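Practice problem: Myotrophin
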Amino acid sequence: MCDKEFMWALKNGDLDEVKDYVAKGEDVNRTLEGGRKPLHYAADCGQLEILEFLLLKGADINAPDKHHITPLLSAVYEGHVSCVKLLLSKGADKTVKGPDGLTAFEATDNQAIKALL
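Answer key — structure tokens:
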């Protein structure tokens, strides 16, 4: 068990492997070796099922990574509409500014995400 495989599981949708790490003692809020938290890796790659599992285990929906980026901003940057919907419906702060100074509204050009914000 190592962080490198944990980050891969969150990125690639391996929910069972993510459940393995958590059941074996992993903290769903710990910033991994890559500089991001589990929610950041799941939201960046649009893993909707992992996002749900992480929040139910107590993951901070607004926690930043090492680059002042929230899980909501990470999902917006790659246009994961369903992930934006789930994070917003769970109370994600839409007013946080990214590392470039723009909020989730100003950072995206996809108007479908802009409507939900």
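Discussion: The CA atoms of residues 46 and 88 lie 14 Å apart. Students who identified this feature from the tokens alone can consider the problem solved.
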